[PDB]
Ligand binder design. Structure first.
Ligand code: ADP
Ligand code: ADP
Ligand code: ADP
Ligand code: MG
Ligand code: MG
Ligand code: MG
Ligand code: MG
Lengths: 364, 130, 75, 75, 46, 52, 77, 536, 76
């Protein structure tokens, strides 16, 4: 469905794939390095390629939404009252112990926040915590009073992605929280999508290590789902090109060439196998027929013209929907990686062979 | 059967965090130490999860479907009894094996620890397997 | 050498009736190497079979070392 | 290519590994293709030919089943 | 699931007592329903 | 959706051959990511020829 | 004698009855021939040919076949 | 059931396309009668006797129960238009349905859906370009009257329509009051910060625009004063109750003589906090949490107003307007517990006003920032709710006009001009996309047609006259002033809408066109439906 | 393909058909059952049968004749 936007998505997909791999060394692409974020509203023309990190979590602070020259810190412990792993209670026997406990808890929280601030941190990411309040209200007040953006409820599964993106080493104890363990960035701000939600984008990092984020926007949810599926398909195609550096013509040319060559091969296989190979070639002759039928053309004449032209000697000849006939398909820039066709053939043949070995169905 | 509402309708009493993802349920029961949750399904497998990290520590399959789970409180790792099959089975999660079995819905572990009730639809001494 | 040939033949005969008969030679070499790597131990659980979708059946192989399906820490 | 293909390949490989491990444990081998079945049936027939009474008929039926197994193989 | 051809035996003979016990009540119900349907539907419809 | 894998997964096919075709689509998506419709079309044509 | 319900099956039965009425023999060959013709037509339709074109081709091929049968026939006393 | 053996129904070909067009046309015809100043409102009974009288398209489509997913696509399209623009909710639905109908009509003639989609995309892009290049009016050359005219145009077809001469001024003043500048010097208008309170009673004319803020709350205790002449507002985000230790703290008494002192401290802590707050001179205390009785008595004796259970957003707005600071806790950076005078807001007056047998708090003339609030008076609750919806639409329209300084003539002038331009433009673009662009242009004419039909006037002749005027404007270089000619629904004749003061924000038309085109493209892309039977 | 195992059904309700293996199985089963029933009444030392009618009359018949045995049996 995203064809009128292909002029925007194709360079975006190529840039996304190139930015997460090393072209001179990589033999495979890990698509988990390309995060796709779907936000309702706007139009697919508003899809953006974010070099940094995009977080859907909202800022707990109020009044602080834009920080320049940020020093993002990733925290895996809780900023609340002390609570050991062992079962613990505080026993009060005198009236002075009450406000002593209150004052000591306040001092503990203040010391934690001061230690965090001393490193120069100004943006704090707090990992999601259970069985213990990750961010106390008093802790949030102290953090706000020292001008630090606070983002909490960070998912555990996103820690690796965040560390890869902005170069922050996670901190689990306040003793090891130091400035050199933070992750510098050019800008970290929260933007609003024209009254359709808020996104936190950290764009510009000192160490942008092999990670990119893709923002997908659309009018309704169904078109957004289809757009992200299509973007994933484009990324997978570029991944195939990375794995196997081979290109083949499209528009039904490989299938027609395969049918012709396999017919010629079957003509030299006298026996009962010649019929089977001829049937294989005739079955491979189906994809161009389907392309011609969907294009609104006459499948018979179109397919026989393809076969005749391939027999002539030109193998880069396929369906030309734009022209409405048969011509050289490379002029239409319709190409696909060889891995797609090879895998399709191999997997389909293996599935058919497995099917042919079945002769009974038993209901358990 | 008992499922508490979604929003918790409170004012951040540091208990609104509940996980309760329910990725497995017929015998969900919190353990002695709250860091682990034990749940069972109709596939005949008993699943142990760590509530903090949030992933399945190790699954237990030795049965048909399992119905009732009871845990003997000791580190939450010592033992837990399953009586889902007509086969009361006791597992140790320091080894992940069925330590002992009794081929005989509402199994209850006795507070003493030497026996456990096996109410179905008996006081089985663990020291004598009878 | 005779024992290795007998192992080859036995694995081939066992795999002849199954769907692996398409690549019987490759799979027979595969199984014989996998069993011989046990150094005489009967522990069949020491051999781990990982089923990954996609690819051809002939793409199956025995790793010269070992493969784990876990994750490394963050830093 | 399919999950069913992977499961069947795993089962076949498990069969091959188990048979190879058993052969490693005990290296005695016999010929397949119905050779062992026909040899056992021939021995049973030889025993039956020297046995009087309906026990001979029972032995002949036993040998008939033993020969029927490779008959099913050929069918 | 074979051997359908059975021709049965005196087994049904051994259960003629209960067969007739139920069949007499069934026949009485059929007679009552036949006397009821001689009018109902036969004239109610038109 | 226009994706072959998604189309075959979303609708609950019941015949075993259709289930194996769905698994074939999933495998093609895993290994390549494109051509998921073409592989199913090829398998269907191959079996259609196998009929005769 | 079949208890068919499909309309095309009834058409096949009528075809057999017609062959029996006109000739009296060959009531089984007609059904097999029609089935084979419709199978080939199914293949052609899957390839994308209008059914009327298939019917016209079948009609002219039948004309050719009838002419050939007349040609290769032999007379008996 | 066939060779597929899927547990569900399947529709393919023209059947599913016709079904989708039927659903879209049903959704359109639901709201077509409520478009334009001669439009009429609708009742909605919620199966339990609840009544909703409205003219807003988004509300109508949200309250309705829709089953066909194309009807849903249209409903969420209207909701998206409401969220992102705030006006033109009915227009986008009508345009999308007409576009889909004409696209299906093209497809039935064996025109491939790809060609229709490409033509629609090209027509939408060219229509946006033409609107931005030839149909925009800069608001800097019109002044305040442009804002009033835009608000009045928005208020037409609403229950505050005829009384729009009075409501437009109130909306403009309210929007201009909450204006504030941010970084990079780009003024922004946080509309929906103008609190709207509904209270039946007097006529619509008696609607009051508060030069401050209005709280739908009352004082906690009857003993406190109900008016402060110099407000020192202190905003708190915590409850003022008896102190209770946390879950991890237990009180174990071994010496019985300490229990009384502990119990005394349990309340003395809150007493000390309240005394610290009051010692700075605060007159008004607003808190999001509750307040116990004795804490209220402290303010009673101090002669200070105290309001409890204040909404968080209301507290934020009050703190921003009055210059106060929200304090979730009393704790400085020295580890102590103090309250400074710098955390106090200031207002000229805080009054417990009475409005139709109910009371509310008015914070009048806040300093360091100007705020606004509107109290709507009507016959009953339904009328007040419709007033609130129309007022929100007008506020959004004024916000769009102030943000983007371009406006377009109303009354279908843009639609007719675009239809003429696009039908002339289609002849110079491709061969198969020509029909798609022509059908896009013809589908754009549904808006003036609907207006004229609602007026019960000659739609054909009126639309023909509009098209003739716009054609003359487009082909004659010296008659370019006819671009502004729209529809005068009162008299049923063409009229210069720019001179008549019928304006709309350009963003409304642009976003309507884009969203409608995308929805039509999404629905048109379908050619087969599989509906799996429910497993239950 | 076959009429019974086809994606579309060509039969009235209650009408079915049995293909090669199934038809042969049913025919052989019926023939063997009939032969086993009628036998054991063959030769000088053959025994007789009791034909207990299930009708209202409930006619009782003790016979050795195979034809009479085969006549008065409900055969499907
Ligand atoms: N290549 C072969 N040639 C002849 N006979 C074979 C061959 N492979 C296997 N067999 C015979 O087939 C029989 C069944 O083997 P198989 O089907 O592989 O496993 P299972 O014993 O579980 O049926 C064996 O008894 C073996 O003798
Ligand atoms: N512009 C084009 N002209 C001709 N053929 C095309 C064009 N674009 C795609 N095709 C063909 O359409 C076939 C289907 O591709 P597509 O639907 O994108 O993915 P899939 O192969 O998974 O169906 C491809 O084999 C390709 O050769
Ligand atoms: N005074 C007026 N004269 C002519 N046309 C008007 C006038 N006021 C509004 N209109 C037109 O009536 C149309 C319907 O607007 P309306 O339905 O009230 O907005 P919405 O679609 O948000 O409900 C608008 O496109 C506008 O151009
Ligand atoms: Mg074997
Ligand atoms: Mg593709
Ligand atoms: Mg004959
Ligand atoms: Mg409006």
């Amino acid at each position: 469905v995203v064809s009128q936007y292909s002029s925007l998505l194709s360079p975006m997909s190529v840039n996304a794939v190139m930015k997460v791999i090393d072209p001179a060394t990589a033999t495979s692409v890990d698509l988990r390095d390309i995060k796709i974020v779907k936000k309702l509203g706007g139009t697919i023309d508003d899809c953006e390629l974010v070099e940094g990190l995009v977080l859907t979590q909202k800022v707990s602070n109020s009044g602080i939404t834009r920080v320049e020259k940020a020093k993002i810190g990733l925290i895996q412990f809780c900023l609340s009252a002390p609570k050991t792993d062992m079962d613990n209670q505080i026993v009060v026997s005198d009236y002075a112990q009450m406000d002593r406990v209150l004052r000591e808890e306040r001092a503990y929280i203040l010391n934690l926040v001061k230690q965090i601030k001393k490193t120069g941190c100004n943006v704090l990411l707090i990992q999601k915590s259970i069985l213990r309040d990750a961010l106390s209200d008093l802790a949030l007040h102290f953090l706000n009073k020292m001008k630090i953006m606070v983002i909490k409820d960070i998912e555990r599964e996103d820690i690796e992605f965040i560390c890869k993106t902005i170069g922050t080493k996670p901190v689990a104890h306040i003793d090891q929280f130091t400035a050199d363990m933070l992750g510098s960035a050019e800008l970290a701000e929260e933007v609003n999508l024209n009254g359709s939600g808020k996104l936190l984008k950290i764009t510009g990092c000192a160490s942008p290590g092999k990670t990119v984020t893709i923002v997908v926007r659309g009018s309704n949810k169904l078109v957004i789902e289809e757009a992200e599926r299509s973007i994933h398909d484009a990324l997978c195609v570029i991944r195939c090109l990375v794995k196997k550096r081979a290109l083949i013509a499209g528009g039904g040319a490989p299938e027609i060439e395969l049918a012709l060559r396999l017919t010629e091969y079957s003509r030299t296989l006298s026996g009962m196998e010649s019929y089977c190979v001829r049937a294989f070639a005739d079955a491979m002759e189906v994809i161009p027929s389907t392309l011609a039928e969907n294009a609104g053309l006459n499948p018979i004449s179109t397919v026989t013209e393809l076969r005749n032209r391939h027999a002539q000697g030109e193998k880069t000849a396929g369906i030309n929907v734009r022209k409405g006939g048969i011509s050289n398909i490379l002029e239409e820039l319709v190409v696909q990686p060889l891995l797609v066709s090879v895998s399709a053939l191999t997997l389909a043949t293996e599935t058919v062979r497995s099917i042919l070995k079945i002769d009974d169905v038993v209901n358990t | 059967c008992s499922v508490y509402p979604l929003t918790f309708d409170k004012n951040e009493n540091m208990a609104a965090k509940k996980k309760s993802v329910a990725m497995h349920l017929s015998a969900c029961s919190f353990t002695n130490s709250d860091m682990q949750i034990l749940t069972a399904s109709g596939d005949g497998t008993c699943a142990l999860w760590d509530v903090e990290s949030g992933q399945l520590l190790q699954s237990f399959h030795g049965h048909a479907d399992v119905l009732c789970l009871d845990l003997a409180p000791s580190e939450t790792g010592n033992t837990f009894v399953s009586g889902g099959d007509k086969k009361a089975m006791v597992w140790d999660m320091r080894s992940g094996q069925c330590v002992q079995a009794f081929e005989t819905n509402s199994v209850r572990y006795y507070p003493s620890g030497d026996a456990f009730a096996s109410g179905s639809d008996r006081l089985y001494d663990l020291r004598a397997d009878r | 050498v005779k024992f290795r040939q007998d192992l080859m033949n036995i694995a081939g005969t066992t795999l002849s009736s199954k769907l692996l008969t398409h690549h019987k030679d490759h799979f027979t070499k595969l199984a014989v190497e996998a069993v011989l790597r046990l150094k005489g131990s009967g522990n069949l659980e020491a051999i781990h079979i990982i089923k990954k979708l996609g690819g051809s059946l002939a793409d199956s192989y025995l790793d010269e070392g070992f493969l784990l399906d876990k994750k490394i820490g963050v830093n | 290519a399919t999950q069913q293909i992977l499961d069947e390949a795993e089962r076949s490989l498990h069969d091959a590994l188990c048979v190879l491990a058993q052969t490693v444990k005990d290296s005695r081998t016999v010929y397949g293709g119905g050779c062992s079945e026909m040899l056992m049936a021939h021995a049973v027939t030889q025993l039956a030919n020297r046995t009087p009474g309906k026990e001979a008929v029972a032995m002949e039926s036993y040998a008939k089943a033993l020969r029927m197994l490779p008959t099913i193989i050929a069918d | 699931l074979a051997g359908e051809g059975i021709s049965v035996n005196t087994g049904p003979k051994g259960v003629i007592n209960d067969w007739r016990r139920f069949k007499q009540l069934e026949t009485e119900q059929r007679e009552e329903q036949c006397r009821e349907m001689e009018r109902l539907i036969k004239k109610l419809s038109m | 959706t226009n994706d072959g894998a998604t189309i075959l997964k979303q609708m609950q096919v019941l015949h075993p051959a259709a289930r194996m075709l769905v698994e074939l689509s999933k495998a093609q998506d895993i290994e390549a990511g494109d051509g998921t419709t073409s592989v199913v079309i090829i398998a269907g044509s191959l079996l259609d020829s196998c009929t005769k | 004698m079949m208890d068919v319900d499909h309309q095309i099956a009834k058409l096949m039965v009528e075809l057999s009855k017609s062959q029996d009425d006109e000739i009296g023999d060959g009531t089984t060959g007609v059904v097999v021939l029609a089935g084979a013709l419709l199978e080939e037509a199914e293949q052609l339709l899957d390839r994308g040919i209008h059914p009327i074109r298939i019917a016209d081709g079948y009609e002219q091929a039948a004309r050719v076949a009838i002419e050939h049968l007349d040609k290769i026939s032999d007379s008996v006393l | 059931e066939g060779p597929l053996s899927v547990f569900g129904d399947r529709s393919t070909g023209e059947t599913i396309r016709s079904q989708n067009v039927m659903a879209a046309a049903s959704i359109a015809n639901i709201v077509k009668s409520s478009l334009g100043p001669v439009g009429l409102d609708k009742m909605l009974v919620d199966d339990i006797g609840d009544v909703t009288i409205t003219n807003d398209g988004a509300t109508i489509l949200k309250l309705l129960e829709v089953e066909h997913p194309a009807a849903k696509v249209l409903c969420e399209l209207a909701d998206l238009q409401d969220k992102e623009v705030g006006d033109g909710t009915t227009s986008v639905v009508i345009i999308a349905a007409e576009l889909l109908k004409n696209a299906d009509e093209l497809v039935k003639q064996k025109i491939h859906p790809t060609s229709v989609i490409s033509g629609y995309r090209l027509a939408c892009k060219e229509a946006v370009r033409y609107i931005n290049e030839n149909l925009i009016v800069n608001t800097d050359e019109l002044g305040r009257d442009c804002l009033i005219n835009a608000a009045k145009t928005s208020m037409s077809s609403k229950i505050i329509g005829i009384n729009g001469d009075f409501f437009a001024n109130m909306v403009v003043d309210a929007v201009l009051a909450i204006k504030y500048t941010d970084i990079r010097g780009q003024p922004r208008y946080p509309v929906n910060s103008v609190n709207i309170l509904k209270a039946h009673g007097r006529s619509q004319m008696e609607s009051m625009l508060i030069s401050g803020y209005a709280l739908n709350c009352v004082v906690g205790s009857q003993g406190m004063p109900k008016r402060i002449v110099n407000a020192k507002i202190a905003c708190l985000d915590f409850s003022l109750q008896k102190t209770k230790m946390k879950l991890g703290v237990q009180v174990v008494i071994t010496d019985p003589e300490k229990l009384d002192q502990i119990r005394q401290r349990e309340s003395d802590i809150t007493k000390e906090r309240i005394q610290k707050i009051l010692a700075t001179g605060a007159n008004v205390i607003l808190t999001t949490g509750g307040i116990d009785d004795m804490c209220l008595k402290y303010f009673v004796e101090a002669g200070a107003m105290a309001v409890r259970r204040v909404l968080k957003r209301d507290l934020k707005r009050i703190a921003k307007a009055s210059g106060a600071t929200i304090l979730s806790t009393l704790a400085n950076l020295e580890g102590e517990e103090t309250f400074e005078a710098a955390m106090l807001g200031q207002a000229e007056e805080v009054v417990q006003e009475r409005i139709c047998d109910d009371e509310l708090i008015l914070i009048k003339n806040t300093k360091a920032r100007t705020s606004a609030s509107i109290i709507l008076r009507g016959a009953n609750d339904f009328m007040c709710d419709e007033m609130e919806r129309s007022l929100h639409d007008a506020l959004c329209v004024v916000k769009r006009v102030l943000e983007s300084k371009s406006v377009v003539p109303g009354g279908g002038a843009v639609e007719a001009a675009l239809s003429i331009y696009l039908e002339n433009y289609a002849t110079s673009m491709g061969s198969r996309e020509q029909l798609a662009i022509a059908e896009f242009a013809r589908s754009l004419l549904v808006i003036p047609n609907t207006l004229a039909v609602n007026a019960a006037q000659d739609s054909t002749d009126l639309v023909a006259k509009l098209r003739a005027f716009h054609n003359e404007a487009q082909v004659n270089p010296e008659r370019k002033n006819l671009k502004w000619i729209g529809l005068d629904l009162s008299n049923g004749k063409p009229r210069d809408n720019k001179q008549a003061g019928v304006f709309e924000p350009t963003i409304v038309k642009v976003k309507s066109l884009k969203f409608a085109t995308e929805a039509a493209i999404t629905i048109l892309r379908i050619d087969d439906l599989i509906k799996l039977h429910p497993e239950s | 393909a076959s009429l019974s195992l086809a994606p579309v059904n060509i039969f009235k309700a209650g009408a079915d058909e049995e293909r090669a293996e199934t038809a042969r199985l049913t025919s052989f089963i019926g023939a063997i059952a009939i032969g086993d029933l009628v036998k054991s009444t063959l030769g000088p030392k053959g025994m007789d049968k009791i034909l207990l009618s299930s009708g209202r009359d409930a006619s009782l018949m003790v016979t050795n004749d195979g034809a009479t045995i085969l006549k008065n049996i409900g055969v499907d």
